[PDB]
Each structure stands twice: as structure tokens, then as C-alpha cells.
Amino acid sequence: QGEPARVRCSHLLVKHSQSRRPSSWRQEQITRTQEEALELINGYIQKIKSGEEDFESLASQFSDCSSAKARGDLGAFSRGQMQKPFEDASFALRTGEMSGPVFTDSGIHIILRTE
């Protein structure tokens, strides 16, 4: 009750060979396994938690989503606009919180709720 109509999120996507589209601006063919993507995701999370790296800086360098060009920013979205697992994870975050690994048809994500 009272939920905001929209949230704004940045994310870092690591695709794998069973992503809906196993290709990105980084690689014409993404051949890593889902487990390898999860290992990379957990490595990125650790780098962010330790303060060695900034979330948006990692997303701009390493996210397999075209939103890497926007430093991970997807913009604001309402319910029904993102894939259900991503939507649910996003709306479950408090503003400024970062998720753990989120599994979608696109790959594995880290999500940072920015608004």
C-alpha cells in the first residue's frame, strides 16, 4: 500500500550462454556459463562492498547491458515494465540499497536502487 508508482535503478548485467540474447556490446557471442556469470557477479559485489570500485564505474565497464553506456542507469520504471524477477527485486530495495544476484531471462544482475 502506498508504493511509489516508479523506482529508478542502475544495474550491472552479466550474461551467459543461456541468456535470451547471448551477445552484447562486449562480445558477439557470450559463451560463459551461468555459474561463471554468477562468479563474476559475486566478484563485482565484493569489489563494491569493499569500496575498491564504484557501482556505476563497474557497470559502465563490465555490464553486458547496453545501459552500460548510461553507467548502468535504466531510468525510472513502473510495475509491468521490467521482467518480473528484476521488477520485484528493484521494488524490494530501499532507496540507495544494492541487491544481491538477481536471476532473469537476460542473465544475472546486480541492482542499485537510485530513487
Author numbering: 49 to 163
Anything the authors wrote about it?
Pin1 is the only known PPIase specific to pSer/Thr-Pro motifs, which is critical as phosphorylation increases the isomerization energy barrier. Pin1-catalyzed cis–trans isomerization can profoundly impact protein structure and function, as confirmed by cis-specific and trans-specific antibodies. Pin1 activates at least 43 oncoproteins, inactivates over 20 tumor suppressors, and downregulates global microRNAs, acting as the “master” post-phosphorylation regulator of oncogenic signaling networks. Pin1 is hyperactivated in most human cancers and correlates with poor clinical outcome, whereas humans with genetic polymorphisms that reduce PIN1 expression have a lower risk for multiple cancers.
In this manuscript, we report the surprising findings that ATO inhibits and induces Pin1 degradation and suppresses cancer cell growth via noncovalently binding to the Pin1 active site, as corraborated by nuclear magnetic resonance (NMR) and co-crystal structure. To explore our unexpected noncovalent binding mode of ATO to Pin1, we co-crystallized excess ATO with the Pin1 PPIase domain and refined the structure to 1.6 Å resolution with excellent statistics. We noted well-defined novel electron density in the prolyl binding pocket of the Pin1 active site that was trigonal in shape with significant Fo-Fc values at 4σ. Although anomalous signal at 1.0438 Å was weak, isomorphous Fo-Fo maps calculated from ATO-soaked and Apo data sets showed clear density for what appeared to be ATO with central arsenic density peak >6σ. The electron density was nicely situated within the Pin1 catalytic active site positioned within van der Waals or hydrogen bonding distances of Leu122, Met130, Gln131, Thr152, Ser154, and His157. This model of ATO binding was consistent with the degree of change in chemical shift for all backbone amides in Pin1 revealed by NMR analysis. Again, neither Cys57 nor C113 were close to the ATO-binding pocket. Notably, ATO titration did not affect the cross-peaks for Cys57 or Cys113, further supporting that Pin1 binding of ATO is not Cys-mediated. The Pin1-ATO co-crystal structure predicted that an M130V mutation would disrupt ATO binding, whereas an M130I mutant would bind to ATO like the WT protein. Thus, the M130V, but not M130I, mutation in Pin1 disrupts Pin1 binding to ATO, as predicted.
